[PDB]
């Protein structure tokens, strides 16, 4: 199945969902998904639903890469909460097509031998930049709020960027 | 499956269940739910029955949520038991489309780390608010009923304006 | 699956299954059934089958007020077992179309903090008030017959009122 | 599945299997089975084929009302080995559709708190009747045999009255 | 199911997926599912999107030769990561359609009784050879190169030659 | 399943895989494959591809008797590798139909109570025989080439008779 | 283990537990020390400390005899709860030396084929006399009480003549 | 085991421990202490150290209860928390012997069919009489506070009457 | 066992391990440790080796508390790692006996449902407070350098004042 | 256990192994040993037999700190291999004391978010300058020759610097 | 356990066994026995009873190495088989104690990245050497003795050279 049945039912609507842990597994799935539906019609909009606690930086970044490989708009809903990669894939929807629900929520939060600490320095510092990119901000005051753990409200979130609209009806 | 299969055909005749624990799982697939049916027509209504014991307040609010954004009524059936989120849910429903069954009952409840308590107090707040207001009472008396455990009965249920009918019969 | 196979083809015969322990998940799932069917066609019959050790009490209310709810007969038959609520149940259906196949057997049985035991204790009067209200009885009677755990024979059953007749052919 | 997809293809053939112990889960599912069959149409005989250590009487004597129950002839076939409430079963096909395969073979048995032991004296008596009238036999007989664990040949169960024929070539 | 849904679905769409270690058994499946889109239709492209830590020369040698086999031409993206035989295979699509997401990030590695030396010498030193052919790089440099476990950027990746193109939107 | 689903597509191509070890499950199941195929249309070709470490003899014999059996042309496949009874399957495709990849690789290889010993040996002596007729080489160099676990590229496979062709591109 | 330390070295100050369910293996167990320490000492006291929730008949029957059997006095305690099982053996302490905390609460219950039914009756009612003796009241309130799962409170108990003594310090 | 050796010797110092939830199983073992170290010396000390988030109420009172019922003092000692039974147990301690660590806290809280009811309402009501006996304070105030559940530091405890001292030292 | 009967021998040395995650249960058996060795001897030292992660505040204060009550002196060694809760009892040990080993190194680390918060508020101020008062630093840079995850090296330890000596050997 | 008793036995003759892989549980293990041995009599030797292929460094170098502490000659016996970690142990062993078994190998090897880096690095270089303090050698030869994985013989450890003493006979 | 308590007790009459796969951590074990011995006692014989399919050439020649460094004699007994690695040992003890009992036998077998094959031709090859210097064989014959897997009868392998009695009666 049923809640397979739903979602790809859902899929046919062109709507997603980024409902769990941003693991590989997830994110190979997810971008399956964009690429599908890309293919399917390169023009009509698709929605991303997210309701997710984030998870891996690399992870999310390939579905980033896919969003902006799509030649279509993806519109990105905070749907409950959208946290560290949650949040930025919520940042990285099409500009105009970012809302958040009413009770949304947006937590930034600083993310997770030698040779894996240089490839991880190097794409915190490319997030970093996205995430001030997407949402207005200062590098500095994006790195400073993930430290402190920030969590924003729909109303707060609106205002710092993250998103475009917050929706009550939809239409 | 029999059960997926039933939900599913279920789901056809716009007919959705609140049939356990509101957890975030749960609430993700009644998302996903309401999404589809709102997808598949914006027009006709959505039936939702609820037999919960409640559950997570945010997960309970992002169902609220996606119930506000789908254009379409939302018709609630306490079917059973309707208690914390799942009374909340049902006190949601579309004015004059709320419903309980005879033998039906409601159970307010008060519900469920220095970052996460910030989160709750707001969120906490915003429930009884709009518990207050599906409900027409002061917000006083929703938090003090809430502390005291009160449980009503369909009829006291429909005294209280957490529903606008009780059915016997349907048509 | 076979067995679910079975299930839903023997459910587009508007024909249903109270088969095992009473419980809000099977619950949940009759009242599903129950309704998907009222809806598909709310003039002809349902043949409920039983055999079943019954259960909780709300749980079994519940499926109660969805029985009542459908505008369409419910016919109930005794089939093996009908044992707490699931006597209940078999007593519940449309009077004149409530059978006992001819070694079922029908089994009362005196079911199942401070605010849980409110709702229970009005909840059991009220099984009490239509179980006598089902079968002709005192509710006296109901209680002290519950009490010694009486059970019944088909013919027993027939004469105490939880049902119509016995069946041997069908048609 | 592929001994599902055996089993399905074959129940739209009306042929049955009781091919294990008689428990009330394989009990359920044939008496969903013989109604599913006696639903779709009424006037078609039913093939039952028995290779089953029998089990439960209850279970089997619920099998055995659904049997009378539906409105057709249900034939019964000994297809290697009806012992207790298998040979029952066995017996209590439509007569003159009762068969056994050459080397199938028939076994007799003695089957199986204070509430219980009411229940199961009450259903045991009623299991004896029935065999004797099934079988043709004195109810002395019937008892004295199921304790002395007596088995048949195929050629033997003729006799004895459990079976009308035994097939060799089927047309 | 849903992840196999979605593969099933985006392999009617000529799209394919390494998406994890390059063993045996995914080995397999892929040439299995190059072959069956070859076999569809021989002169559509396929695509293939890596997002694999490599694995198994002789595994990915076999899905190399299948590669070179189909007749029609092979896309690569890499998306996420290509280390290992991950790369290899990303530098070994078509020439022209070799791309990298802005993301992704290329590592070369050098991968990996007396019998087995030998078949392993000859393939590995065949894997740097057609490495050196895909990337335009001489030899010594893939050698090198692979000892001292360098990565690349999307960037630093089309200039080594491995990849023909960064994409940021499709069409 | 992804995997089954790529797999029965490219079943309907008659196109069919030794993807492992050759025990008697798989040995079955890649019979009954040939025998189906055979079934379908006794004319059109069957392509078998060959990645495979070997495995039991007489399950491989199985394969093998089948292959003969079935009426149509078996085309053959060194893909990866080809290593005991999997090198003799290879060889005994239909001459003129064998094909390697230009990376596969065979391997032969010695294989694997007093009433088994005598059954081993025969069928030892048996394969030893096939595999020289299969190959045009002596029994002798079959054996000695076996107890010093022989292995060869493509190329050379091509000259000692495994295979006819070494495929770049197919048509 | 320090719990079986703790209660070994109990045992040396000739002091024992009844501490859960009244089953078959536990029966065995207090009658193994109640055996063991008439054996290593016949003229000195047992202390039995009971917080149960009672048990099975028979196996209390055999705690019973073994208790009757130890040629020494046995001490009861009733530490918390004595119920069922738990609460005849409290009863059933040397007359003059049976306690109960000031806290502790007292249950009766009415306790738990055609062989066993026999077999339960007869020692059912050796209970209700036993315990009717223990107890000095009459075997019909002994039933009646029983029925009604009457409970005691430590005053109460001492009133009903389950025990000699409330006891508050020791000595 | 090391840790139960640990608590053997530490009883070998008559020095004992409440270190977790309060459970039947624990709540035995722990009067099984009290009762063996009383027994080893009727006159010497006991110490029970206290970090406990409490439990069942009529487990702690059994405790309570063996307490009292050993003729020796208890000194008692809220190391890290004491909280419902475990502050009630606390409480309890030898008046004067009474102790917080600095750092321990303190916290009252509400504690945890119709037959258990009553049983629960006697022994509620129980505990807070003795609660505030211990305590010094009002029966009104007990009861407030654990509906408010209201926690306190060592300070805090001292100054309401939980505990006679705050140790720093020892000796 | 081995281990367990080494640590026993080594206890009985004065010497205990803090070995891995501070949680209740271990902080339990320290506790427990430090009472026992308190207990045999007031006057003698205790040893405190630590190479442990840290872990709950409040399980780590508990330790604390019972390290000040134990009379005797408590000599401190950082033997591999100290971090959060682990370097806090580094540092608590008695002033001139705080070691750390060669190659130890201490980590700080800002540590870990409206009720818990207060509780956790209070807790987290007072292990601040505390750390700054057995360091020499003020509570500000305890802070900060918690949050910014500062590590330390033997040599910064010591300067940073969370040990008195760099022990190399012992005596 | 046997295993255990035979290693307790052997800890009384000052015997201690290292005889796996040096992870943090084993490395407390050893540390707690030394730690006895030492406290039992600092005068003594101990010998450390080591058949391990090394493990974590900062465990090795945690074993080592302990070995500097413990006053007493730490004699190192190579028995079998000494990799990695293991190497260092033996080569850290008391100069004089430090033997190889005639058929003992010693393995050099290159051992094992950005904070870890950081602390890593500081002691990966650590290590080194010990090894080569240990060993004689210049501190770009250990390193050079850890790169290259270069393993010894018995003969060549001693030449190299690892160990003082080829050992035949003991005594 | 019984099993370790037997093994125990044995080694208390310098008896010991190798009766399983020689890997690293028996081998380690063996050894700490053997130097247990040794310690206890340097002039008393130790008995090695060998059972053992042999294993690990290395784990073996830790074994030994152990066996030659310990300053007493080793005596050996085939007790069932000795084969690879058991043989060596067997072959190993001292010459003159070498003992196959009547039904023993030998078995000698050819045993078991780029580093790891110099190390272990280095080993293999140190193992034909002792081996031949045990049995007083050319190197020659060892080789060509283990490729082809050449057993022994106890007659034979005294004549052979692995042992030096066969034993009946024991004294």
Same mark, same amino acid.
């Given at each position: 199945?049923?809640?397979?049945?739903?979602?790809?039912?859902?899929?046919?609507?062109?709507?997603? $969902?980024?409902?769990?842990?941003?693991?590989?597994?997830?994110?190979?799935?997810?971008?399956?998904?964009?690429? &599908? /539906?890309?293919?399917? !019609?390169?023009?009509?909009? %698709?929605?991303?639903?997210?309701?997710?606690?984030?998870?891996?930086?690399? @992870?999310?970044?390939?579905? +980033?890469?896919?969003?902006? *490989?799509?030649?279509? !708009? %993806? @519109?990105?809903?905070?749907?409950?909460?959208?946290?560290?990669?949650?949040?930025? /894939?919520? =940042?990285?929807?099409?500009?105009?097509? #970012? +809302? =958040? *629900?009413?009770? =949304?929520?947006?937590?930034?939060?600083?993310? *997770?031998?030698?040779?894996?600490?240089?490839? $991880?320095?190097?794409?915190?510092?490319?997030? $970093?930049?996205?995430?001030?990119?997407?949402?207005?901000?200062?590098?500095? #005051? %994006?790195?400073? !709020?993930? !430290?402190?753990?920030?969590?924003?409200?729909? =109303?707060?979130? &609106?205002?710092?960027? $993250?998103?475009?609209?917050?929706?009550? #009806?939809?239409?």
């Amino acid at each position: 199945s049923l809640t397979d049945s739903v979602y790809e039912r859902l899929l046919s609507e062109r709507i997603i $969902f980024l409902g769990s842990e941003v693991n590989d597994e997830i994110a190979n799935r997810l971008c399956a998904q964009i690429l &599908l /539906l890309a293919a399917e !019609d390169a023009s009509k909009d %698709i929605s991303l639903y997210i309701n997710s606690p984030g998870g891996s930086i690399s @992870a999310g970044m390939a579905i +980033y890469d896919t969003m902006v *490989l799509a030649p279509c !708009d %993806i @519109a990105t809903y905070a749907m409950g909460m959208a946290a560290s990669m949650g949040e930025f /894939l919520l =940042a990285a929807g099409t500009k105009g097509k #970012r +809302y =958040a *629900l009413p009770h =949304a929520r947006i937590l930034m939060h600083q993310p *997770l031998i030698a040779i894996q600490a240089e490839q $991880f320095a190097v794409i915190k510092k490319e997030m $970093f930049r996205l995430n001030a990119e997407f949402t207005g901000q200062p590098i500095e #005051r %994006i790195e400073a !709020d993930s !430290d402190r753990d920030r969590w924003f409200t729909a =109303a707060e979130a &609106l205002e710092y960027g $993250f998103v475009d609209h917050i929706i009550t #009806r939809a239409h």
